[PDB]
Amino acid sequence: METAIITLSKDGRITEWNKKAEQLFGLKKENVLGRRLKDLPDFEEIGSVAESVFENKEPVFLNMYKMGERYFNIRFSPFRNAKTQLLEGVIITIDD
Numbered sequence: 001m002e003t004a005i006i007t008l009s010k011d012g013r014i015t016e017w018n019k020k021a022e023q024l025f026g027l028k029k030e031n032v033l034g035r036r037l038k039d040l041p042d043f044e045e046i047g048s049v050a051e052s053v054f055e056n057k058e059p060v061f062l063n064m065y066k067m068g069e070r071y072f073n074i075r076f077s078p079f080r081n082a083k084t085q086l087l088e089g090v091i092i093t094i095d096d
Contacts, residue, residue, distance in 0.1 A: 001020065001024060001095070002020070003018070003093060003094075004021040004025070004093070004095075005017075005018045005091065005094075006021055006094075007089060007091050007092070008054075008089050008090045008092065009088070009089045010054065010086075010087065010088060011036075012036050012037055012047060012050065012051060013034060013037070014032050014033055014034065014035055014037055015033070016029075017033065020094075024094065038051070046074070046092065049076060050092060054090050057078055057087060059075065059076060059078060060075070060076045061073065061074070061075045062074050062075075070096070072096060073094070074092065074093070076090050076092055077091040077092075078090050079091060
């Protein structure tokens with residue numbers, strides 16, 4: 001699988017959750033949108049990694065990252081608003 005994407009706001013709230021993420025994690029976008037990723041069971045560690053990547057302003061790419069019983073690559077990409085340059089959130093991309 002490739003391109004499961006969860007995007008978080010500056011405060012850690014789910015602003016995107018694509019079909020690959022629904023497929024991968026078994027939660028529907030409509031049910032998780034607006035919620036804190038770190039509130040979701042089993043997303044505590046990824047939530048805390050996302051918080052750290054945001055605070056430090058440098059991307060993290062983990063390989064051989066175990067979730068459930070599978071290994072993943074997971075990239076955390078901080079991003080800024082084009083106009084304001086305000087650090088706006090983190091895109092999390094998960095691949096096999």
